[PDB]
């Protein structure tokens, strides 16, 4: 149907906006601490600690399958990145501190993305 097509065009445009948001967020992680999944070879107990692991590569795979239906979904996955790190790692670590910096800096980007997703509908 034409209605299905139009819904597909909206999903595509959302996907374009989210790809730009994701690039912007990832620039706030210049050390690439959150680029890839935590390795189970190197942290074999990770899944005893963290139930829903997340990372930028995994988000990117989801995005390119047009797997985010709305910004809420995407923000959920970004928040998991930060929130998992701040539970697994102690306050006095380079990991935790990088998460705090990513959260603070990413908040600015997401504040305006919310206005763009509403605005362009």
UniProtKB/Swiss-Prot annotation:
The gene is BRD1. It is found in: Nucleus; Chromosome. Scaffold subunit of various histone acetyltransferase (HAT) complexes, such as the MOZ/MORF and HBO1 complexes, that acts as a regulator of hematopoiesis. Plays a key role in HBO1 complex by directing KAT7/HBO1 specificity towards histone H3 'Lys-14' acetylation (H3K14ac), thereby promoting erythroid differentiation. The chain holds residues 555 to 674 of 1058 of the full protein. Component of some HBO1 complex composed of KAT7/HBO1, MEAF6, ING4 and BRD1/BRPF2. Component of the MOZ/MORF complex composed at least of ING5, KAT6A, KAT6B, MEAF6 and one of BRPF1, BRD1/BRPF2 and BRPF3. Interacts (via PHD-type zinc finger domain) with unmodified histone H3. Interacts (via PWWP domain) with dimethylated and trimethylated 'Lys-79' on histone H3. Highly expressed in testis. There is a cross-link at residue 41 (Glycyl lysine isopeptide (Lys-Gly) (interchain with G-Cter in SUMO2)). Disulfide bonds: none annotated. This is Bromodomain-containing protein 1. Residues 9-113 form the Bromo domain. It comes from the Eukaryota.
């Amino acid at each position: 149907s034409m209605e299905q097509v139009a819904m597909e065009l909206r999903l595509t445009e959302l996907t374009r906006l989210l790809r730009s948001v994701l690039d912007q967020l990832q620039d706030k992680d210049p050390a690439r601490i959150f680029a890839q999944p935590v390795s189970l070879k190197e942290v074999p107990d990770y899944l005893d600690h963290i139930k829903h692991p997340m990372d930028f590569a995994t988000m990117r795979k989801r995005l390119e399958a047009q797997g985010y239906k709305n910004l809420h979904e995407f923000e959920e996955d970004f928040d998991l990145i930060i929130d998992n790190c701040m539970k697994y790692n102690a306050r006095d670590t380079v990991f935790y501190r990088a998460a705090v910096r990513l959260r603070d800096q990413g908040g600015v980007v997401l504040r305006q993305a919310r206005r763009e997703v509403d605005s362009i509908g």
